[PDB]
Amino acid sequence: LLIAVFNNTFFEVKSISNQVWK
Amino acid sequence: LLIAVFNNTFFEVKSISNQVWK
What we know:
part of a larger assembly, 2 chains, mainly alpha, 82% helix, rod-shaped
């Protein structure tokens, strides 16, 4: 069930991580 | 298959849970 939480919470975290790395 | 069942009905469940808890 926690897989569902990980799925819906990837796009925004990915964008934020990209910005932080940049 | 059952992963997608929880996956397709997640965001509304989370919002309703937040409303009910508050």
